[PDB]
Design a protein around this motif. Structure first.
Motif: not given
Ligand SMILES: O=C(/C=C/c1ccc(O)c(O)c1)OCCc1ccccc1
Ligand SMILES: O=C(/C=C/c1ccc(O)c(O)c1)OCCc1ccccc1
Lengths: 109, 115, 115, 109
Positions: A36-48
């Protein structure tokens, strides 16, 4: 959400936003398969990143691209990246400084 | 001594003693080649991993076996190990001290780099 | 040397040099009395704060002036200072090393206690 | 919620629950006046310490009773407590170990 990652910036006192990371699962031949992979959001969180069905027992690696993050801010970092390797609800938190990082796991019911 | 590692135990407030670690260097073919290894002393320190001649420019990985350390104390830790991956010496020789602070579900690492 | 303090800079990856700190001891009337003070050296260390005779049982507070340190570097930090408050020597004399790692919006402290 | 505190337990990998803390504001005579207090929830968070109107510029101290927390778990801690002193939306996070603690601030818009 069986796996979430939270990243914080200790220099600016903020969430670390747009931090890229990849998650790997260790395979039988002892190599790291992308999971899996992704980028942190504006809240610095990465979900799902994954689902309950998909998130089976195993050794997982979270490789966080801290180097690109510091570079985008104009600051020379020490580490190439920050890894978190663990046997597997999980929250991984990472606190980033240019020459230091901390990571902790919050493992709940 | 261009590379030293210091490991502390945040649960007991002591040096973390007899912690094994392996150091690897990224080869030309992008694989990790073994570079050096050792165990921390009674002061939680590992000296003499390498020399100034041997410690050329490159990307290095220090893999610290925190799991075996915690297990030998009866604790089941979260992490398999603690890694530190960094480019070394690309602006000339430096001296690196890698410090790691260990808890069962947490670790922190910092580097002190001097000329 | 029963009490030593080591301070590191997580932004620059260096010892934090010339960091001032004051040590206080809780008096019988529950007020903080001045005990010792000093500044870190070029290695980020402060030795010789006290002696085994002087360093009796009690509750101690180490107040590290992280704000002036960050300000002298052009950074406006979050914290006024970093404190460490602990009971010392209540099971006999120990040696204490207090380690602090500093970032503008974060700090961590750990203690290594030996016999 | 202009001020929130989050506390995590690095030994058990969980939120630190039922951790008591007091918040003080520095007064003109340079003493610490009680301002707010509470205990962390099951998520290790403490919310509603103050309001926007009430939370004016000043030097605040958050004194977290980490010692009682470790004692209730049967583990001897080093610190009497953990203080966070700062000039003032704020989230203060503290990560607790028996002989160590870290604290970071996340200051957002
Ligand atoms: O924000 C955090 C942790 C921030 C932090 C603190 C100290 C650190 O040393 C660090 O590296 C990071 O905790 C979030 C975890 C969480 C999420 C949902 C429910 C319960 C627990
Ligand atoms: O013992 C240490 C650092 C321990 C420590 C502190 C805070 C941490 O968060 C951590 O993980 C480890 O200092 C050694 C580093 C050094 C090397 C050469 C010259 C000056 C300083």
């Amino acid at each position: 959400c069986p796996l979430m990652v939270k990243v914080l910036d200790a220099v600016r006192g903020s969430p670390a936003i747009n931090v890229a990371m990849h998650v790997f699962r260790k395979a039988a031949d002892d190599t790291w398969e992308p999971f899996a992979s992704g980028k942190t959001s504006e809240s610095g969180e990465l979900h799902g990143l994954t689902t309950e069905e998909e998130f089976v027992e195993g050794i997982y690696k979270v490789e966080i691209d801290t180097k690109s993050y510091w570079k985008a801010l104009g600051i020379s970092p020490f580490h190439e990246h920050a890894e978190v390797v663990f046997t597997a609800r999980y929250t991984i938190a990472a606190l980033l400084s240019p020459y230091s990082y901390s990571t902790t796991a919050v493992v709940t019911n």
